[PDB]
Amino acid sequence: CTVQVRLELGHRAQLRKKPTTEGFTHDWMVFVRGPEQCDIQHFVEKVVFWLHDSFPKPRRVCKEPPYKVEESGYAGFIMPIEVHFKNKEEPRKVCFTYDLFLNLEGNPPVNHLRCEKLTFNNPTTEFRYKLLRAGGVMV
Template identity: 70%
Template sequence: VQVNLELGHRATYRKKPTPEGFTHDWSVFVRGPEGNNAAHFIDKVVFHLHESFPKPKRAVKEPPYEVSESGYAGFLLPIDVYFKNKEEPRKLHFQYDLFLYTDMPVNNIRPERLTFNNPSEEFRRRLIKGGGVSFTYLDIQYSR
């Protein structure tokens, strides 16, 4: 079963920095593409913010899977996506580049296509409900 996810972020440059010196407001997210509800197969998303943030490990258990903060610099942001799956894979790890611009807003989306080979019937149903597409051996043969 193949299913699509979107990792992304939005960021805006503040007209005036905060007292802490933060120059940007930003939000980072994990979601299904438009019209697809990833909550059918995602259990939780853990965002590992830079260690300078209070409580840098942020777990989001319900949609929207999103964290919003203010800061002054971009950083590499590890993201763990946990699935409603009793078998492996139970989670996937992504490295996300949360970059910032000073001269314009950021609206970035990174598409990810995930393939689950031979998922359990229960997890397969969850993936299909969340917008996944099932491919059988015959589908692959005819598509060549």
């Protein structure tokens, strides 16, 4: 059997009224979540967000919801995001390369969503139940 689950990755960015002491222009927030009335914590062990090289402790881990990072910056960057599963077999995780882009001065805030369907072929019984408890569907 095959079980499909959905993830939503997203981000919001806007200009700060007042730049930080480093002079960062923007606040941003990146997240991983499930669709409404779904609970991805049943099958997700943790989410790791890899911030820009410039950050202190760039490896940011969320072991429970909300799976989100909120920071300030001057520029967008490519953000590796790892979603680790409560699985004993492969795949143990999925990796996304997320386009964290900011609004150019003048332009309204950014509020984006990237929807990902995961297809698990022949998951173990134990993991199958986690996917289905999260609101996954047999296909």
